[PDB]
RNA sequence: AGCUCAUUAAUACGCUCAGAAUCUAUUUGGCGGGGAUAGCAGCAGCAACUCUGGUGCUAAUACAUGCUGUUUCUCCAGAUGUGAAUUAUGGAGGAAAAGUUGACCUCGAGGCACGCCAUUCGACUGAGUGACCUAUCAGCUUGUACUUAGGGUCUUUACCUAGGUAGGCUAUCACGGGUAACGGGCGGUUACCGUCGGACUGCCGGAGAAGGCGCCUGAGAGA
């Protein structure tokens, strides 16, 4: 459970990573 | 010329391997020509150093030049009061600092706008002078 | 010497909210939020005084605490929590959705609304800057920090939002010809056309008309540019801001 | 004589919700009576309705008063407070004896 | 929050502005990345108290450990933003630990940290200005007034310490004295103009806890 919980708690972090990345390639176009 | 115990400079500025700076203050004032060709500091000029101009904007005659880079206005208010109908004449003196890029005699109307505290008196400092010739104790409202 | 302080007293709370001089001397005092304290609507006062569904303040802390109602996507179990201009309110059991939205007299009311529509929400820009690696951001009357946001987002700009991801679709722009309800002062919950910008030296105002045509002015800071010419991106209440007048 | 009067469905503590305005000549209605004819009105039955705090005008015969009535037993356990569940049928002793925890360790 | 009006004659209060000279727990949105004690167990001491000594253990979202930023200085550029900043931000250098290192509860969901920026409730600094008597109170002021450099502060300033000038306020009432003076929203009296009262005023802001004075803890106290 535990080790779930922190792999989950580390995936989060990557999936915010990947979608500021987006958020930035995304309006670079336009930017 | 730098005459006292601390070596004068002018900041932001680095001598490198003269230069002077100068600023826009903005508000509808053109920045006057005498800054840009003079030997001066001053920390606290607005165009020279580096104070900015910010909130209210008077006008009065000027009574004092005493001090050092440093006038006395007095601004001159009529005072309605409700009783009598009537108004009184009032005033309030309000000193200021000067640049010496400025040339200011006794006795003639100038502009001031405030900034941050530069003494316990000063508020105060000059952005636009109109020259006047010739004296005070005159009564001029604007 | 004043501190931060708790208890708001009645008369001292603010003339939108239409309390009573009796039931009591204290009222709710807003949590810190998005909203400011006088802009604002608490969600304890929301369900008390204007839907009539708890009649006690001990029963509206509790569907609160229930957690049937949702502020703008997310639940908010803490209630006293301040909502103020374009939020959304969806409700659990019995389901309904709200925008909480200006009255023509400066007053708050509250308004049943199609789903498809009360998804989204509009965001003023009060304040642009640049910050971390050059990048443009926003803060807007909520306070919330958009940031990547594109170019031709200058302040008094609205911004289309859509809630489910956190986007900017549309972005209207400040003009003259352009739909504005005035949100604070005299004209506070007035439509208006923009017919002259004033721009101000130092510290502007802006010049507005009614579909009956009247004319009144306002700081630039009060109006939220609502939509682009005449139609509004938005459900408007009965009478539309105009305000009655013999 | 029972008017019903600006009712509306408080779907959250799943109640429909209302004030009630009858109207008695010659002065004489029993709370008890009222959940009668009401329950009848509304398919409800006695126990479901809650009636309370309803007052008499000044001299003719007439009574109003407030009352609400939900599916089920599941609002008025948990929903209502309870100085109303005593009357209908369901001391400084702590500021004394309790700051004696205190006092004593 | 509550109580009171003894100080206070404008520094307070009010009403306009202002932060480009600032700090901010909590909310909210972004951006981030093993050993040692407390109860519990036991032996004692006081005329006395909501004081404790000393030994025998054990807890953690308490405390310490740990898989690019923060602070500061130098230089080169100085935005699509502002009335205006050689500002925001970017790049090239050095330093420093003052440090972001989910070492975590309950049954796939709810909740809780840490740091930075904003935001919110505010706070705090500065300006303009309004008003009770007194000439049997006409001259007052030595950090007193400007300037340059520093210390200190959350910041700005004689706030304080230096060097250099000798200034500032005043018959448009300075300075001094008096008040049976907390200021304001307002209250009583009235045809209008006014005038008297305002501890309370069913609120707002200030000050004080027998009298001064000092300080710890904290986002915030001279409680």
């Given at each position: 459970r535990r080790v779930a919980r922190k792999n989950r708690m580390l995936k989060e972090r990557k999936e915010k990573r990947e979608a500021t990345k987006k958020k930035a390639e995304q309006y670079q176009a336009l930017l | 010329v730098q005459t006292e115990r601390a070596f004068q400079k002018q900041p932001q500025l680095f001598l490198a391997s003269k230069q002077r700076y100068v600023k826009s203050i903005g508000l509808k004032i053109e920045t006057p020509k005498t800054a840009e060709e003079r030997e001066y500091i001053d920390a606290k000029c607005p165009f020279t150093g580096t104070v900015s101009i910010r909130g209210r904007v008077l006008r009065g005659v000027v009574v004092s030049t005493k001090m050092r880079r440093t006038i006395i206005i007095r601004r001159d208010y009529l005072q309605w009061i409700r009783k009598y109908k009537r108004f009184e004449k009032r005033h309030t003196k309000i000193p200021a600092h000067i640049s010496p890029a400025f040339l200011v005699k006794e006795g003639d109307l100038v502009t001031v706008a405030?900034?941050?505290?530069?003494?316990?008196?000063?508020?105060?400092?000059?952005?636009?002078?109109?020259?006047?010739?010739?004296?005070?104790?005159?009564?001029?409202?604007? | 010497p004043r501190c931060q302080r708790f208890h708001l007293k009645r008369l001292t709370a603010?003339?939108?909210?239409?309390?009573?001089?009796?039931?009591?001397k204290f009222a709710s005092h807003p949590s810190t939020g998005p909203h400011?304290?006088?802009?604002?609507?608490?969600?304890?006062?929301?369900?008390?005084?204007?839907?009539?569904?708890?009649?006690?303040?001990?029963?509206?802390?509790?569907?609160?605490?229930?957690?049937?109602?949702?502020?703008?996507?997310?639940?908010?179990?803490?209630?006293?929590?301040?909502?103020?201009?374009?939020?959304?309110?969806?409700?659990?059991?019995?389901?309904?959705?709200?925008?909480?939205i200006y009255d023509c007299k400066g007053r708050?009311?509250?308004?049943?609304?199609?789903?498809?529509?009360?998804?989204?929400?509009?965001?003023?820009?009060?304040?642009?800057?640049?910050?971390?690696?050059?990048?443009?951001?926003?803060?807007?009357?909520?306070?919330?920090?958009?940031?990547?946001?594109?170019?031709?987002?200058?302040?008094?700009?609205?911004?289309?939002?859509?809630?489910?991801?956190?986007?900017?679709?549309?972005?209207?722009?400040?003009?003259?010809?352009?739909?504005?309800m005035v949100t604070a002062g005299g004209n506070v919950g007035r439509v208006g056309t923009i017919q002259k910008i004033e721009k101000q030296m130092a510290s502007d105002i802006v010049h507005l008309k009614d579909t009956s045509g009247a004319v009144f002015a306002t700081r630039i800071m009060n109006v939220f540019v609502i939509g682009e010419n005449e139609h509004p991106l938005i459900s408007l209440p009965a009478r539309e801001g105009v305000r009655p007048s013999i | 004589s029972v008017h019903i009067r600006k009712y509306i469905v408080n779907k959250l503590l799943d109640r429909?919700?209302?004030?009630?305005?009858?109207?008695?000549?010659?002065?004489?209605?029993?709370?008890?009576?009222?959940?009668?004819?009401?329950?009848?009105?509304?398919?409800?039955?006695?126990?479901?309705?809650?009636?309370?705090?309803?007052?008499?005008?000044?001299?003719?015969?007439?009574?109003?008063?407030?009352?609400?009535?939900?599916?089920?037993?599941?609002?008025?356990?948990k929903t209502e407070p309870k100085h109303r569940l005593i009357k209908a049928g369901l001391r400084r002793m702590r500021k004394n004896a309790r700051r004696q925890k205190v006092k004593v360790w």
């Amino acid at each position: 459970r535990r080790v779930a919980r922190k792999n989950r708690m580390l995936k989060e972090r990557k999936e915010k990573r990947e979608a500021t990345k987006k958020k930035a390639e995304q309006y670079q176009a336009l930017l | 010329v730098q005459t006292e115990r601390a070596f004068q400079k002018q900041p932001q500025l680095f001598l490198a391997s003269k230069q002077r700076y100068v600023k826009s203050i903005g508000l509808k004032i053109e920045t006057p020509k005498t800054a840009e060709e003079r030997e001066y500091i001053d920390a606290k000029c607005p165009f020279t150093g580096t104070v900015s101009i910010r909130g209210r904007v008077l006008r009065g005659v000027v009574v004092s030049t005493k001090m050092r880079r440093t006038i006395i206005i007095r601004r001159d208010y009529l005072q309605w009061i409700r009783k009598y109908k009537r108004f009184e004449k009032r005033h309030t003196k309000i000193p200021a600092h000067i640049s010496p890029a400025f040339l200011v005699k006794e006795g003639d109307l100038v502009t001031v706008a405030e900034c941050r505290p530069l003494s316990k008196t000063v508020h105060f400092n000059v952005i636009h002078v109109k020259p006047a010739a010739v004296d005070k104790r005159q009564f001029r409202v604007f | 010497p004043r501190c931060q302080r708790f208890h708001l007293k009645r008369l001292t709370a603010p003339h939108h909210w239409l309390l009573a001089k009796s039931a009591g001397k204290f009222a709710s005092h807003p949590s810190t939020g998005p909203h400011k304290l006088r802009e604002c609507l608490p969600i304890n006062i929301f369900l008390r005084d204007r839907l009539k569904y708890a009649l006690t303040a001990k029963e509206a802390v509790a569907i609160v605490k229930r957690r049937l109602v949702k502020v703008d996507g997310k639940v908010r179990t803490n209630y006293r929590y301040p909502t103020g201009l374009m939020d959304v309110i969806g409700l659990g059991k019995s389901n309904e959705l709200f925008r909480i939205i200006y009255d023509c007299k400066g007053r708050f009311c509250v308004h049943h609304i199609e789903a498809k529509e009360a998804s989204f929400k509009l965001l003023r820009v009060n304040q642009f800057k640049i910050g971390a690696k050059g990048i443009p951001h926003v803060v807007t009357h909520d306070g919330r920090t958009i940031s990547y946001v594109d170019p031709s987002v200058r302040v008094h700009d609205a911004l289309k939002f859509n809630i489910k991801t956190g986007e900017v679709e549309s972005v209207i722009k400040f003009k003259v010809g352009d739909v504005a309800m005035v949100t604070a002062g005299g004209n506070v919950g007035r439509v208006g056309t923009i017919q002259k910008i004033e721009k101000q030296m130092a510290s502007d105002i802006v010049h507005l008309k009614d579909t009956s045509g009247a004319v009144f002015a306002t700081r630039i800071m009060n109006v939220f540019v609502i939509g682009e010419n005449e139609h509004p991106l938005i459900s408007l209440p009965a009478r539309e801001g105009v305000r009655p007048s013999i | 004589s029972v008017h019903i009067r600006k009712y509306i469905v408080n779907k959250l503590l799943d109640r429909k919700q209302f004030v009630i305005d009858m109207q008695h000549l010659g002065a004489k209605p029993t709370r008890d009576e009222i959940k009668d004819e009401v329950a009848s009105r509304l398919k409800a039955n006695k126990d479901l309705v809650v009636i309370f705090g309803l007052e008499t005008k000044f001299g003719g015969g007439h009574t109003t008063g407030f009352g609400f009535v939900y599916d089920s037993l599941d609002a008025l356990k948990k929903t209502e407070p309870k100085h109303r569940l005593i009357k209908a049928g369901l001391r400084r002793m702590r500021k004394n004896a309790r700051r004696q925890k205190v006092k004593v360790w």
